[PDB]
């Protein structure tokens, strides 16, 4: 089989021009799609903030309308899902992963309009969920669609387009070209056997959707933190310590989110009316909270820059943390359409900033700025819950642009994945998929 | 399905045994790389020192510059040809082979040969890069601790070999990310599934990067300052630049390969004509490393200078041609030392050139040529070696102008596409494929 290898080596990197062109298209589409989804959620969140002014005096009358529209939008979303496409609830990242191992369907004719409008509902009412869930899943189907509509044949072309789509989807969600590509080749491809995903193809698709994003969002970064200070070597240990805390806590959080799905299922028993009401209940809570205590609701992106600067008290930071662990669970677990990715970054930052404050005070000789621990902690929860550190690390580096913290960032990430492994937690997506694949079988 | 559920719930459980061993592999490879780094400095220094002792009498100095580059060149070409022929050239191809389990990993031989051999070739100012030596050296360090500790298993063998090569690259450019990415882009068995543990690779890299920062802290290999931005009405120019590197990348591969062929005839495989021809080329280098410094050397020096746009356009064309010549001569002649670094230098110079033209055909775009330099820097790595993701990241880690990520990506992709469509192969897969055939043939 040596001869056989000389045959493949000399043949390497020859992805059919057919598939390369289709990636371009997939990326462009997924990009636009994501841009549009992005705009919708802004609009709806803005209406809600508009209506709130119109009832600015009567206080309980205002707390009322904040709830009732988030409630109405949540419901509208939970419904579109439960009725027309149950497989597009929760994240959908686990679902696209299954598609790659060829173990779940890719019902685009259903998912596309459901995930899109459904999330537009849940996200738009200020629920604690992330744009990426909808965009990553949405993107995978857009890649399925152009594979069907163009009747492209062969394992390569099917796995490749489904991949470039999911990439372009993430890329467009954070304006993160690299994170997107890295996502496919770290956590997205079939994890146990070889696959024929063309990385060049993924590239084009991401390039296209990043352009599309930049054409409409140009000149305003999702997060803007300024250039933070540096990291002396006699400081690196502190980041390892921070990694361990995330590592013992990452697995716990996973238990919680899973058990929480189980527990919330008893409330509606699987019943589409108790669900859609319980959904509008949680959603209503969010829009109310998005007004009386705004940092406990929402996606989370607003308070990153605030926490990193060190503008929250320690008490406030503890508050925000607890409040958000509660709302992030409540929203994702209850199977609303929308990812868990983004709110995790938020918890990381807040936790890290907290550690940072303590750190800064026990070690004045180190001349610390708590805002670095915030950045090292930001993608740390993704490292211990998700178990895709390389991807989380690069994602943060593309959004916070303080490359000088690359060593601490890495050390905290590795600190997390190690202690998440040694305290027995599984990758929260492989876990979710594993439940789904059993849930299919266990009842036959 | 009942099979997959089993694997999913079992994923990411690399034995603590292997994770610990990664840490030591990295630490070792780090130190080794640090030491190698220092040696080449020292030897280059002596050459500059002795050069002053003979500062008057011009032809007498041009003589000493040659003779010790010559003497050091030969010393290296020998250590290889005699005690470990498999450690000539890059060794990146040789480690890649080790992963497919198709080449041996003679560390007891390679370690001391590559190390001292390169210290020879590099130290005399030859146009080769530190990474060749370090990457290969790193794999063997990983082989060594696998043997010396008798670790059993396919995983533990493939993993240590990998993390070693990673920590090897990492320490070569203070590039933790580029390191890891290298393994999972261009270094793992490309066609079948393997059991390399990415977590282990991580630890190894962290350890060697710490080692490097412990001794080199407070001075970046390349320093360019924060260049300007990239308007969207400008991206097309980067795609164009990608295409030029894409038609040229395959050409270069032809040249380097055919050059290996051609240089073999001059010595016929004969260890004496080789070592002489080696000290010849190496002599040439240290002479040039004085009379026209930018044509010789690793190349890192002129990046900052070219990116600032301090070279004339004439000078840039000169540097380019001169270097295409010396880079071929040096790597093709099997001298121990990688081809990575000098490639970065060519890209920069080529890009900066394009930049200048670009800047005066489009004053409305308000261009700064220095960005085309940076987008072109890892473009040659994209079209010759064909690992763009790894090249792109590497540059980003050394130049730190993340704001150019899109143009960088576009030029990269522009290259890999046109290298594909004009028939070139991955220069590393090509070299390996020559070696394996030259074996069963």
């Amino acid at each position, epitope marked *: 089989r040596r001869r056989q290898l000389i045959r493949q080596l000399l043949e390497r990197d020859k992805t059919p021009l057919a598939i390369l062109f289709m990636a371009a298209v997939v990326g462009t589409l997924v990009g636009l799609a994501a841009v549009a989804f992005d705009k919708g959620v802004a609009w709806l969140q803005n209406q809600r903030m508009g209506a709130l002014v119109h009832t600015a005096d009567n206080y309980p009358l205002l707390l009322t309308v904040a709830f009732l529209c988030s409630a109405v939008l949540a419901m509208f979303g939970y419904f579109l899902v439960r009725k027309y496409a149950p497989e597009a609830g929760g994240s959908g990242i686990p679902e696209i992963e299954g598609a790659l191992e060829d173990q779940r369907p890719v019902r685009w004719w259903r998912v596309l309009p459901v995930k899109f409008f459904g999330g537009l509902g849940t996200l738009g009412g200020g629920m604690v969920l992330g744009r990426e869930g909808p965009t990553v899943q949405i993107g995978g189907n857009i890649g399925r669609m152009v594979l069907d509509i163009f009747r492209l044949k062969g394992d390569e072309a099917r796995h490749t387009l489904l991949a470039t789509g999911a990439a372009a989807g993430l890329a467009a969600a954070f304006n993160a070209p690299l994170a997107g590509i890295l996502f496919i080749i770290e956590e997205m491809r079939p994890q146990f056997r070889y696959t024929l995903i063309s990385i060049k193809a993924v590239f084009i698709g991401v390039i296209m959707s990043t352009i599309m994003y930049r054409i409409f969002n*140009h000149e305003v970064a999702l997060i803007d933190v300024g250039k933070l200070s540096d990291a002396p070597l006699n400081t690196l240990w502190l980041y390892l310590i921070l990694g361990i805390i995330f590592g013992i806590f990452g697995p716990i959080f996973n238990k919680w989110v899973l058990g929480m799905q189980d527990l919330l299922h008893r409330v509606h028993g699987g019943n589409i009316t108790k669900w859609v009401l319980m959904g509008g209940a949680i959603g209503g809570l969010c829009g109310l909270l998005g007004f009386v205590a705004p940092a406990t609701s929402g996606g989370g992106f607003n308070l990153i820059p605030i926490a990193t600067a060190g503008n929250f008290s320690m008490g406030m930071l503890v508050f925000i943390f607890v409040a958000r662990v509660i709302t992030t669970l409540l929203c994702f677990s209850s199977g609303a359409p929308g990812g868990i990715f983004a709110p995790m970054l938020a918890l990381g930052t807040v936790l890290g900033t907290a550690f940072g404050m303590v750190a800064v005070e026990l070690f004045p000789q180190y001349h610390l700025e708590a805002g670095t621990f915030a950045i090292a902690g930001m993608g740390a929860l993704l490292a211990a819950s998700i178990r895709a550190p390389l991807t989380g690390i690069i994602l943060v580096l593309e959004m916070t642009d303080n490359y000088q913290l690359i060593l601490p960032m890495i050390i905290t990430g590795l600190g997390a994945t190690l202690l998440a492994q040694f305290t027995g937690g599984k990758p929260l997506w492989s876990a979710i998929l594993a439940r789904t694949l059993a849930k299919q079988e266990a009842e036959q | 399905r009942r099979q997959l559920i089993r694997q999913l719930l079992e994923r990411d459980k690399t034995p603590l045994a292997i994770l610990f061993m990664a840490a030591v592999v990295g630490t070792l490879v780090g130190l080794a790389a640090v030491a190698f780094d220092k040696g080449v400095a020292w030897l280059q220094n002596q050459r500059m020192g002795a050069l002053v002792h003979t500062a008057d009498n011009y032809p007498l100095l041009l003589t000493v510059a040659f003779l010790c580059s010559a003497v050091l060149a030969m010393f290296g070409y020998f250590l290889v040809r005699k005690y470990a022929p498999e450690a000539g050239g890059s060794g990146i191809p040789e480690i890649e082979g080790a992963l497919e389990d198709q080449r041996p990993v003679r560390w007891w031989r390679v370690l001391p040969v590559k190390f001292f051999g390169g210290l020879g070739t590099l130290g005399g100012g030859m146009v080769l890069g530190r990474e060749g030596p370090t990457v290969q050296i790193g794999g063997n360090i990983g082989r060594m601790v696998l043997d010396i500790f008798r670790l059993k298993g396919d995983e533990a063998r493939h993993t240590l070999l990998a993390t070693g090569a990673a920590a090897g690259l990492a320490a070569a450019f203070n590039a933790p990310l580029a390191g890891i990415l290298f393994i999972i882009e261009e270094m793992r068995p490309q066609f079948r599934y393997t059991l390399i543990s990415i977590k282990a690779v991580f630890i190894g890299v962290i350890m060697s990067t710490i080692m490097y920062r412990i001794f080199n802290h407070e001075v970046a290999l390349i320093d360019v300052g924060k260049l300007s931005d990239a*308007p*969207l009405n400008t991206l097309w120019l980067y795609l164009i630049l990608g295409i030029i590197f894409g038609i040229f990348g395959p050409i270069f591969n032809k040249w380097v390969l055919g050059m290996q062929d051609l240089l073999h005839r001059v010595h016929g495989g004969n260890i004496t004509k080789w070592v002489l021809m080696g000290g010849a080329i190496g002599g040439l280098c240290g002479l040039l490393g004085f009379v026209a410094p930018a044509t010789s050397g690793g190349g890192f020096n002129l990046i900052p200078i070219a990116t600032a*746009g301090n070279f004339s356009m004439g000078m840039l064309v000169f540097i380019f041609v001169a270097r295409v010549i010396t880079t071929l001569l040096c790597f093709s002649s099997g001298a121990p030392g990688g081809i990575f670094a000098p490639m970065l230098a060519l890209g920069t110079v080529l890009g900066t050139a394009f930049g200048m033209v670009a*800047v005066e055909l489009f004053p*409305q*775009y*308000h261009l700064e040529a220095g960005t085309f330099a940076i987008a072109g820097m890892g473009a040659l790595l994209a079209a010759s070696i064909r690992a763009p993701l790894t090249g792109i990241i590497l540059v980003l880690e050394m130049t730190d102008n993340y704001q150019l990520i899109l143009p960088m990506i576009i030029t990269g992709l522009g290259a890999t596409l046109l290298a594909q469509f004009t028939g070139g192969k991955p220069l590393w897969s090509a070299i390996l494929a020559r070696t394996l055939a030259k074996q069963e043939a």
Partner: antibody
Amino acid sequence: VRLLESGGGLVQPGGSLKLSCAASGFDYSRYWMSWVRQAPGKGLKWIGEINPVSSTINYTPSLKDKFIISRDNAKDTLYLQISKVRSEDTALYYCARLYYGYGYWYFDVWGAGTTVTVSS
Amino acid sequence: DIVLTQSPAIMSAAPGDKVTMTCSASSSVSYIHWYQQKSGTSPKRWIYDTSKLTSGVPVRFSGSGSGTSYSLTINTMEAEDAATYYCQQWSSHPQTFGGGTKLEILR
């Protein structure tokens, strides 16, 4: 974010003058700077643009040194020497900070203006 | 260097009125910018890349065009709009400014 230009007034026909524009509010490297002018009750005529690293300098069609646009990043200040001055130079001079949208470039934040009066 | 000329040099119109000045250019330009020079103040980036609005510019403002002609439009002009308005291209070099349209309010 403000630009505050200065040093205009009376000049002898034929003599020269250095207008200084001090910037504040924003990082003054990073930015191309420019000068536009307006003669009384008329239109905006562009003069020159200097880049951040003082390496590219462009000018409206003009002769040898009619204009010289320097800048000194140590002081966040732009300058503009005007030479051999004829009465067509009598105008208000704006210092304006450059920037792009999709990439066709615009005069982002404008100064307040200094007035140059060519006379005996 | 592109010669830009502006529709009405001076044009009256009573608040409420939908109002449209024009920028027509000698050769072919694209993505143009519009400045507002209120009387006695300095010019202000108003509309940029032909129809995107500088921040804080009231939505009553619109831009469009292509080719050799562009227009800036106020849908229900309000009295505070009284100004000279300039258009400016930099799609070729050097850049160039319009001649101005001077909006006047009827009351």
